[PDB]
Design a protein around this ligand. Structure first.
Ligand SMILES: Oc1nc(-c2ccc(C(F)(F)F)cc2)nc2c1CSCC2
Ligand SMILES: [Zn+2]
Length: 209
């Protein structure tokens, strides 16, 4: 099964994962409705997910994508937030489980974008205990994943795709809202992502203005 490797805070790998998570916080158009109000996270722990079958399935797909993309995986480290997090670390990503780019598995460069989905779409009803989307008490988890993009198809309008377009492996969707769009990285096969880092954290309440 799955083994969780515990990274130490003094490790460079722990520090780079934290830095990527802290530096990619941005303001969201919903004004903090989904993920809460914060400028920084309190990182509780960073764990490396080790699972032989998930790694085998990921290697196998990686090789296929490489062959169709002039021997390039086109791998990127991206954030993912989901109420399925526990099933992801044990069984892997599952495309069988509304998005602006069709029935895919969505990844963001912004950690704050993935934080909006910890409790489900639009932040759901928030944490189970306080029903608070901006809870500063309850521990949250998000993933920092290896994502095999291969040949990405560039999408600029909302389209309901079932699979990557012919000859392609992923979709880079930019959904325009009043002319502004942040990229969403979409895969349509769970084996095209590995849940490399499990980050346990809290959002932090900014000091009163
Ligand atoms: O990290 C993300 N997660 C999800 C996401 C995960 C699980 C679920 C569901 F609750 F299971 F239906 C819904 C959406 N969507 C997005 C991103 C980052 S890019 C923007 C879209
Ligand atoms: Zn709570």
């Amino acid at each position: 099964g799955t083994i969780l490797l515990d990274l130490a805070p003094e490790d460079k790998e722990y520090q780079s994962v934290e830095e990527e998570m802290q530096s990619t916080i941005r303001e969201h158009r919903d004004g903090g409705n989904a993920g809460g109000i914060f400028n920084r996270y309190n990182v509780i722990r960073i764990q490396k997910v080790v699972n032989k079958k998930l790694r085998e399935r990921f290697c196998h797909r990686q090789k296929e994508v490489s062959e169709e993309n002039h021997n390039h995986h086109n791998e990127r480290m991206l954030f993912h937030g989901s109420p399925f997090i526990n099933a992801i670390i044990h069984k892997g990503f599952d495309e069988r489980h509304g998005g602006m780019f069709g029935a895919g598995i969505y990844f963001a460069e912004n950690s704050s974008k993935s934080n909006q989905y910890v409790y489900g779409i639009g932040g759901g009803t928030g944490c189970p205990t306080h029903k608070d989307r901006s809870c500063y008490i309850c521990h949250r988890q998000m993933l920092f994943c290896r994502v095999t993009l291969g040949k990405s198809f560039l999408q600029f309008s909302t389209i309901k795709m079932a699979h990557a377009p012919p000859g392609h492996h992923s979709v880079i969707g930019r959904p325009s809202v009043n002319g502004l769009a942040y990229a969403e990285y979409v895969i349509y096969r769970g084996e095209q992502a590995y849940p490399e880092y499990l980050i346990t954290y809290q959002i932090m309440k900014p000091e009163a203005p």
